[PDB]
């Protein structure tokens, strides 16, 4: 049967809409099935993706501040494969975005400050409901252009708020940052964003 999707990405387009993306191993398929429903009681929505080349879909008319569960499966001639599951919420009422994604097991929204033309500080809130007690966080930094190597910072500790200063950066260059909690068992969901320092 088809393998489970190896990755499930969420990106908020607005306070009531997001793009769901997934990734299937390079190794047919007929398509995908994307299921979602409110976590506090609601009908099951099932989206059928009849093209295996399509690995993303937009979902609109979502309720703000309501937790949803998303399930993505792949289909082939043999049958359906196991699903990758994800819980997420679009929260909405500090400069920045008025709406933010949140899942209980991921770090809080990323707050960036450009301390200088070649350095910044990043802070994030502790996960609301982590899967296992936290040992620390892994923070990775890399050029969004590609090719260049990534830098991985280990942030030991389980503070309610964690902070990291990143030196050696270049102005006008986009950098992709990833933050994920390290727990006793393994890692949690990672929050990712691209920034650029300018004056």
């Amino acid at each position: 049967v088809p393998d489970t999707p190896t990755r499930l990405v969420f990106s908020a387009l607005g306070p009531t809409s997001l793009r769901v993306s997934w990734q299937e191993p390079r190794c047919p398929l007929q398509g995908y099935s994307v299921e979602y429903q409110l976590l506090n009681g609601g009908e099951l929505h099932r989206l059928n993706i009849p093209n295996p080349a399509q690995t993303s879909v937009v979902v609109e008319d979502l309720l703000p501040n309501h937790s949803y569960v998303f399930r993505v499966r792949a289909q082939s001639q043999e049958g359906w494969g196991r699903e990758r599951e994800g819980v997420i919420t679009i929260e909405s009422q500090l400069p920045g975005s008025a709406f933010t994604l949140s899942t209980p097991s991921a770090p809080g929204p990323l707050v960036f400050t450009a301390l200088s033309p070649d350095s910044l500080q990043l802070s994030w809130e502790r996960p609301r409901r982590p899967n296992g007690d936290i040992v620390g966080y892994l923070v990775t930094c890399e050029m969004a252009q590609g090719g260049g190597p990534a830098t991985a910072f280990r942030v030991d500790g389980d503070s309610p708020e964690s902070r990291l200063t990143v030196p050696g950066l270049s102005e006008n260059v986009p950098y992709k940052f990833k933050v994920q909690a390290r727990t006793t068992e393994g890692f949690g969901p990672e929050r990712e964003g691209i920034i650029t320092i300018e004056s």
Binding site: L8, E85, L101, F112, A114, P117, G193, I194
Partner: peptide, 23 residues
């Protein structure tokens, strides 16, 4: 590819960030 501009001396900015499950 959404990029968030960080301006020096403008203070902290809360960026909109993607969440990823798995790898």
């Amino acid at each position: 590819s959404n990029e968030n501009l960080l301006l020096v001396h403008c203070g902290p900015t809360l960026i909109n960030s993607c969440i990823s499950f798995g790898s």
